[PDB]
C-alpha cells in the first residue's frame, strides 16, 4: 500500500494568460458554510439591486448589491436538542417573482420566504426531494423533483394543483431541467432521453420525443438524459442531452430537424442563433446555426470541470472547478482575459443580471465583479 488514489485524465496544466481587462471585485460577503462537496445547483438571485443567497444547512441572506450588508439574516433551520441540531438540506436555485422567494429543499420542502423580513408565507410537502429550480409561470410554481414528477404548486398558499409522472431509469444521472414557459405551456425535459410537452392549465401531455441513442452497454453507456436547460425560441425547441445530439423540435408538431451531434453535456445558450456549449470535455464549442460548420471551439480547458456560460457583454465568462475565471471572446475566443485564483472551488452557475456578475463558491463567498 504505497499510495492509493491515482489519476487517469491529468487535466489541463492551466496555460498562460493574456490579460487585457484586469477585472476586479468590488466587494464580497460570506454566507454561512455552503455545500462544500455535495453536487447541487445553488445560484444567487437578484431583484431591484438586492442580491439574495442560500445555504445547504442554514441561513439565507439578502445582502445588498452595492455595499454587501445584510437586510434580514433569517436562519430557516430546524429545531434544537441537547447540544446540537440537524440541518435542512436545501437545493434548487433561488427564484424571485414579485415579493416571494421560493427555495427548494432535499427534504421534499419548498420554502416561500418573504422579502420584507424573511418570514415564511406557506409550506407544503411534496413527493421526493427537490433538486430543480421552482419555475414561476403565470402563477404556477411548477417544480421538477427527483422522482420523475412535475408537481405544479400554487402561488397563493400551497394548493398543489396537478402533478405529471415521467419514466425513471434504473440508475439515472440527475433530476434537473425544471420546465419553462412557451406560449402558455411547459416544455419539461426528463431522464432517459424523453422530453415531454405537458400543458400549463391541467397538464395534458401534448407530445413526447426521444432525444438520443442508447443500448451502448448495460447501464453506463446508455446514461443519456436531457437534464440541462430546455430552451425555446422562434418556435424551435433545443434541449441538451447527455450523450447524443441535442435537439431540433417544434412547438406544435415536434419533428426532428438538423441533428448535429456536437454538444451534449450542459447549459447551451442562445444569443442570436449562436449556441455555445460544453460537451463531455470542458471545451467551449461555439456550435453552428443549423447543422454543419461549427465555427470554432477551444482546447485549453480540457478535463477542467467548468460551469454554465455567463455571456457578460459578449465575452463568454465561465469559471472552472479550481476557481479561475478565464474570459473568452465572441468571435474567436483566445483567452481574452482572466482573473486571479479564487480558492474553495467554483461549482455553481454564475448569474448574469444587469450589471454585476454574482457567483457563489463552494462555501458561499459571492463576488460582484467588474472591469
Amino acid at each position: 500500500l504505497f499510495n492509493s488514489e491515482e489519476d487517469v485524465v491529468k487535466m489541463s496544466p492551466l496555460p498562460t494568460v493574456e490579460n487585457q481587462f484586469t477585472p476586479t471585485t468590488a466587494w464580497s460577503t460570506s454566507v454561512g458554510s455552503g455545500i462544500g462537496n455535495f453536487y447541487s445547483n445553488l445560484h444567487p438571485a437578484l431583484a431591484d439591486n438586492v442580491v439574495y443567497a442560500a445555504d445547504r444547512a442554514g441561513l439565507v441572506k439578502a445582502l445588498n448589491a452595492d455595499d454587501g450588508k445584510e437586510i434580514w439574516s433569517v436562519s430557516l433551520a430546524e429545531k434544537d436538542g441537547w447540544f446540537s441540531k440537524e440541518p435542512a438540506l436545501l437545493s434548487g436555485g433561488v427564484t424571485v417573482s414579485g415579493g416571494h422567494v421560493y427555495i427548494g429543499s432535499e427534504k421534499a420542502q419548498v420554502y416561500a420566504l418573504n422579502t420584507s423580513d424573511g418570514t415564511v408565507a406557506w409550506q407544503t410537502k411534496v413527493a421526493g426531494e427537490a433538486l430543480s429550480r421552482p419555475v414561476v409561470s403565470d402563477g404556477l410554481v411548477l417544480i421538477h423533483t427527483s422522482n420523475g414528477q412535475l408537481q405544479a404548486l400554487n402561488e397563493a398558499d400551497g394548493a398543489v394543483k396537478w402533478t405529471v409522472n415521467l419514466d425513471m431509469p434504473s440508475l439515472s444521472l440527475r433530476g434537473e431541467s425544471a420546465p419553462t414557459t412557451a406560449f402558455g405551456a411547459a416544455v419539461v425535459g426528463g431522464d432517459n432521453g424523453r422530453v415531454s410537452a405537458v400543458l400549463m392549465e391541467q397538464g395534458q401531455m401534448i407530445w413526447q420525443q426521444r432525444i438520443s441513442q442508447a443500448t451502448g452497454s448495460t447501464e453506463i453507456d446508455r446514461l443519456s438524459d436531457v437534464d440541462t436547460t430546455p430552451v425555446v425560441v422562434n418556435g424551435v425547441v433545443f434541449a441538451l442531452a447527455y450523450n447524443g445530439n441535442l435537439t431540433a423540435l417544434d412547438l406544435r408538431s415536434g419533428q426532428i430537424m438538423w441533428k448535429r451531434e456536437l454538444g451534449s453535456v450542459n447549459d447551451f445558450i442562445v444569443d442570436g442563433n449562436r449556441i455555445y456549449l460544453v460537451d463531455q470535455n470542458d471545451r467551449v464549442m461555439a456550435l453552428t446555426i443549423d447543422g454543419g460548420v461549427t465555427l470554432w471551439t477551444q482546447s485549453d480547458l480540457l478535463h477542467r470541470l467548468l460551469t454554465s456560460p455567463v455571456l457578460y457583454n459578449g465575452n463568454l465568462v465561465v469559471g472552472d472547478s479550481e476557481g479561475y475565471l478565464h474570459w473568452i471572446n465572441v468571435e474567436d475566443g483566445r483567452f481574452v482575459a482572466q482573473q486571479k485564483v479564487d480558492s474553495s472551488g467554483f461549482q455553481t452557475e454564475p448569474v448574469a443580471a444587469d450589471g454585476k456578475l454574482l457567483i457563489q463558491a463552494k462555501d458561499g463567498t459571492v463576488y460582484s465583479i467588474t472591469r
Binding site: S4, E5, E6, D7, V8, V9, N37, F38, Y39, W82, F83, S84, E86, L89, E106, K107, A108, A127, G128, E129, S146, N147, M168, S170, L171, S172, L173, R174, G175, S217, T218, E219, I220, V265, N266, L305
Partner: protein, 783 residues
C-alpha cells in the same frame, strides 16, 4: 455436375479427417452453390480460421481457406486494485482462454465484456487497450493494458418521507456508510448492489418492530454526478399509521396438536405489534412439529389489518411433510482428518427421522470446531423410496498450524527469545500438543499442553500440562517453580461448565528481604532463619487439587447489555503437601437493563475470595490476592491496596542492586523503613456499580460504538490475623472496614484497530499510604 476429386491444399492446422467431415460433400456428389454456401457457413462456425474461396470449373471442387494468425497467449499489465486471477478466470469462462483461435472481430467485444466487469467492481473509468502482436507460424501474444482511476464514494443517503423518527438513527443500522472518520471504522464508502437489497430489508425489519404494520417502499433510486466520484441513494418510506395486535387465531391441518399450539400462540390483549415476535412464533411452531417427527415444517401467517381502528388479526396455517426419513450420513472433503471427529460434533443420529434444525445446528458446531474453512450441506432424495433421503456435507480444511519465533533487543531488561509451535491438529483426531518458550534474560517459561477435549466421549475434556517458571525478580524474591497439572472439562449444558483436576508444583524462592509482613511462614513451619544473614532459602513440594464452575450468560458478542457471568476457582492440598491452605475466587459481572431499550443499562461487578491456611500453618505469600489497577478499582495504581509491609534492622542485603531494591536494602533505611508497595493480604472484597448512558455528543450514525459510563469503585484487602502484641505503632491491618471508594467516568472506544478503555477516576477516600494515578488507557478488554 459430379465432383471426382476433393482438393485440399496446405492443411495448416485443422485435422485432415476434421476437414473431410466438416464438408457435407464427398467424392461423387451433385450439389449447387447453396450447398457451397452451407460449406462456407460450416467453415465460419468451426472457428479455426476463415479466409475462404470456392472455384468450380471442371470436375474438382477447389475450396481453399487461407491461413491467418487468428494463439491465446494472454498477458496482464500493471493492474492496481484487481487480483491477477479474477480477470484470468473471467476470460477463461468468457472467451480468449488458451486455444479457440480468437478472431479479429472479437477484440472490441471482449474489451466491452471486461469493461462491464470493471463497472461492476465500482471503478467507472473502464479504459482498456488490448493489442495483438503476431508471432511466426500462427501465434499472437495478446497484451492488454488498463488505465483506471479512483473508485466511487458513497455520498449522502438522505431519506425522504420519514416522520416521528430522525434520519440518522435509521442509517445507524445500515451497512452502506457515507461518513467514515479517523475516529473509528465500521464500514466503508463502497457501492455494492447486493448489499443494497439487504439494507432495504433490514430497514423494513427495523421499522416493523414498533407497530407500524403498514409499510410500502414506493421507489428506491440510485444516481451519480457527472465526473462520477459520488453516488446518491434515496428511499421513499410511507409509514401510514400505527396498529396493535388483536388475535393470533390458528387454523389449518395439524395432527391433533392444537392443544399444545394454543399455548404457544396466546397473546396479551392490548400489546403493540412486533415485527420480530411473529418470525419467532413461526420458528417456535416449526420446532414443536419437528420434534415430533416432521422434517420440513411449513408455516405461513397473513395479517388481517382492520381499518378505522388499531387492530390486526393474524391468521396462521401449517403443513409439515409426512416422514422424510434421513437414514444416511456421508462426509467428503476432509484430508488427514479422521471421520470419527466429524460425527461427534453433530447431533443427528443415522436411521432416525429428519429435523430441519438439527442438520443446521450441526453445521454451526462444525464451523466452531476451528480447523474448517467452508462447511456446506446437501439433502438428496434417493431413487425409489419417496421419503428416505441422504444428507452430505462438503468441508474444506484451513491448514491450521503456526511457528512463532521472536528475538528482542537491548531494552534495559536483556535479550529475550521466544519460540512456540502448537499446530492444534497433532494427528487426525484433534489433539493440541504444543511447545512454547519465552527465554528472556530472567524468564525461562515453557508450556507443554497436551490437552485432549473428547476423552470418554460425551463432551468432557481432559488435559495435561507441564510448565517451568524461573521468574528471577525482586520484592523489596528469586522464584523457581516447576510442576504439572491435569484437569477435566465436564460440560453441563449451554453457557455452563465445570472443571476439576489434580496438580503438583515444587517452588524454591531465595534472595528475599526479611519483612515481618511475610516473616511468619517459616518460623511456624519447622525452619528458624537468623536475623543477621540473608542468603537463607526455602522450598516446598505441593500436591494441589483445583476445581471450579463456569457460567457465561452474556447474550451478546462483545458489547453486553444484559445477563450475568460467575466463575469460582479453588485449590486444596490434602494428603502430602508441606503447606495446607485453600483459596477461593468468586466474581460476578451481572448486567441490568433499566427499560425496554438496549441504551440505558447499569452493571455491577464484585470480587471475593478470602482464604486462610489450616493446620496451624499460614498461607504462602506467593499465592496472595492483589487488587487495584484499571481492572478492579480505577483511580489507584497497579495492585497496591493491601497491607503495607514493614521491615526491621536486617540491612545485610548482599551488595544492593543499585535502586532496583530500596526501602531498607543494603543502603536503605536502617530503622523501620515503613515500606510502601503493599503486599496483598489473604482476605479480599471489592464491588463496583456503574451506570451506562448514551455518548454525548456525536452524530447518531456512529453513536453505538462508544458507550460512555459513570462508575463508582470501592474495595478492601486486609489480613485476618496480622498481630496484636506491641505492634501499636503502625495502622491496624486486620480491620476490614478500610474501604477506599473512588468514582469517576469511563470512556470505551472501538478504534479502527481494536478496542480501548479510557477512564479518568478520582479517589476521594484514602488512608496513610496509597499510590494514586489516573488516565489508565488500557486496551484489549473484550471480556
Amino acid at each position: 455436375f459430379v465432383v471426382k476429386d476433393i482438393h485440399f491444399e496446405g492443411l495448416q492446422r485443422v485435422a485432415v479427417g476434421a476437414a473431410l467431415l466438416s464438408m457435407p460433400v464427398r467424392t461423387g456428389d451433385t450439389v449447387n452453390d447453396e450447398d457451397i454456401s452451407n460449406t462456407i457457413r460450416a467453415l465460419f462456425a468451426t472457428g479455426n480460421f476463415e479466409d475462404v474461396r470456392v472455384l468450380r470449373d471442371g470436375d474438382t471442387l477447389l475450396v481453399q481457406v487461407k491461413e491467418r494468425p487468428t494463439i491465446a497467449s494472454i498477458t496482464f499489465s500493471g493492474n492496481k486494485s484487481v487480483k491477477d486471477d479474477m480477470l484470468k478466470q473471467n476470460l477463461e469462462a468468457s472467451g480468449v482462454r488458451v486455444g479457440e483461435s480468437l478472431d479479429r472481430t472479437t477484440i472490441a467485444d471482449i474489451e466491452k465484456g471486461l469493461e462491464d466487469f470493471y463497472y461492476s467492481v465500482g471503478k467507472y473509468s473502464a479504459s482498456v487497450k488490448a493489442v495483438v502482436t503476431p508471432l511466426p507460424r500462427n501465434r499472437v501474444d495478446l497484451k492488454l493494458v488498463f488505465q483506471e482511476g479512483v473508485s466511487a464514494e458513497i455520498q449522502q443517503i438522505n431519506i425522504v418521507g420519514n416522520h416521528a423518527f430522525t434520519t440518522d438513527e435509521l442509517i445507524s443500522h445500515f451497512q452502506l456508510r457515507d461518513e467514515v472518520p479517523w475516529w473509528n471504522v465500521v464500514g466503508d464508502r463502497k457501492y455494492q448492489k447486493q448489499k443494497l437489497a439487504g439494507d432495504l430489508e433490514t430497514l423494513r425489519s427495523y421499522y416493523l418492530d414498533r407497530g407500524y404494520a403498514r409499510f410500502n417502499i414506493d421507489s428506491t433510486q440510485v444516481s451519480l454526478t457527472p465526473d462520477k466520484k459520488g453516488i446518491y441513494v434515496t428511499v421513499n418510506i410511507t409509514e401510514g399509521d400505527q396498529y396493535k395486535l388483536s388475535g393470533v387465531e390458528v387454523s389449518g391441518n395439524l395432527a391433533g396438536h392444537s392443544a399444545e399450539i394454543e399455548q404457544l400462540t396466546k397473546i396479551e390483549p392490548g400489546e403493540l405489534y412486533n415485527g420480530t415476535k411473529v418470525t419467532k412464533m413461526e420458528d417456535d411452531i416449526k420446532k414443536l412439529l419437528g420434534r415430533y417427527g416432521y422434517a420440513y415444517p411449513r408455516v405461513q401467517s397473513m395479517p388481517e389489518i382492520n381499518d378505522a381502528d388499531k387492530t390486526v388479526k393474524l391468521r396462521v396455517n401449517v403443513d409439515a411433510g409426512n416422514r422424510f426419513y434421513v437414514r444416511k450420513i456421508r462426509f467428503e472433503g476432509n484430508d488427514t482428518s479422521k471421520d470419527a471427529v466429524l460425527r461427534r460434533e453433530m447431533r443427528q443420529m443415522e436411521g432416525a427421522w429428519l429435523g430441519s434444525d438439527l442438520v443446521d445446528q450441526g453445521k454451526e458446531r462444525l464451523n466452531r470446531l476451528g480447523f474448517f474453512e467452508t462447511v456446506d450441506t446437501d439433502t438428496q432424495r434417493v431413487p425409489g423410496s419417496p421419503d428416505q433421503v441422504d444428507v452430505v456435507y462438503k468441508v474444506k480444511e484451513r491448514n491450521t498450524g503456526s511457528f512463532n519465533f521472536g528475538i528482542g533487543y537491548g531494552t534495559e531488561s536483556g535479550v529475550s527469545f521466544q519460540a512456540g509451535v502448537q499446530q492444534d491438529n497433532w494427528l487426525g483426531t484433534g489433539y493440541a500438543v504444543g511447545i512454547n518458550g519465552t527465554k528472556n534474560d530472567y524468564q525461562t517459561y515453557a508450556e507443554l499442553s497436551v490437552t485432549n477435549p473428547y476423552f470418554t466421549v460425551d463432551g468432557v475434556s481432559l488435559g495435561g500440562r507441564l510448565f517451568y517458571n524461573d521468574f528471577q525478580a525482586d520484592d523489596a524474591y528469586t522464584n523457581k517453580s516447576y510442576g504439572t497439572d491435569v484437569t477435566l472439562g465436564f460440560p453441563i449444558n449451554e453457557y455452563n461448565s465445570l472443571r476439576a483436576g489434580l496438580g503438583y508444583v515444587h517452588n524454591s524462592l531465595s534472595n528475599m528481604q526479611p519483612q515481618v509482613a511475610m516473616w511468619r511462614y517459616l518460623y511456624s513451619m519447622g525452619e528458624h532463619p537468623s536475623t543477621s544473614d540473608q542468603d537463607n532459602s526455602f522450598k516446598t513440594d505441593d500436591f494441589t487439587f483445583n476445581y471450579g464452575w463456569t457460567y457465561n450468560k452474556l447474550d451478546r458478542g462483545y458489547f453486553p447489555t444484559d445477563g450475568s457471568r460467575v466463575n469460582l476457582t479453588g485449590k486444596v492440598t490434602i494428603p502430602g503437601s508441606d503447606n495446607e491452605y485453600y483459596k477461593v475466587t468468586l466474581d460476578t459481572a451481572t448486567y441490568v437493563p433499566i427499560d425496554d431499550d438496549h441504551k440505558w443499562v447499569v452493571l455491577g461487578r464484585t470480587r471475593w475470595g478470602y482464604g486462610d491456611g489450616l493446620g496451624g500453618k499460614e498461607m504462602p505469600f506467593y499465592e496472595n490476592f492483589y487488587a487495584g489497577g484499571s481492572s478492579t478499582v480505577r483511580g489507584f495504581q497497579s495492585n497496591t491496596i493491601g497491607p503495607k509491609a514493614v521491615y526491621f534492622p536486617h540491612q545485610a542485603s548482599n551488595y544492593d542492586p543499585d535502586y532496583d531494591y530500596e526501602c531498607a536494602t543494603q543502603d536503605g533505611a536502617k530503622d523501620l523503613c515503613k515500606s510502601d508497595d503493599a503486599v496483598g493480604g489473604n482476605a479480599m472484597a471489592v464491588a463496583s456499580l456503574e451506570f451506562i448512558t448514551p455518548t454525548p455528543f456525536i452524530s447518531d450514525k456512529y453513536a453505538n460504538s462508544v458507550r460512555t459510563s459513570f462508575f463508582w469503585d470501592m474495595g478492601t484487602v486486609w489480613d485476618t490475623n496480622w498481630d496484636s502484641s506491641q505492634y501499636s505503632g503502625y495502622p491496624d491491618y486486620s480491620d476490614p472496614s478500610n474501604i477506599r471508594m473512588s468514582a469517576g467516568i469511563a470512556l470505551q472506544w472501538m478504534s479502527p484497530l481494536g478496542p480501548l478503555v479510557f477512564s479518568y477516576a478520582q479517589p476521594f477516600k484514602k488512608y496513610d499510604g496509597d499510590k494514586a494515578e489516573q488516565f489508565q488507557f488500557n486496551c484489549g478488554k473484550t471480556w
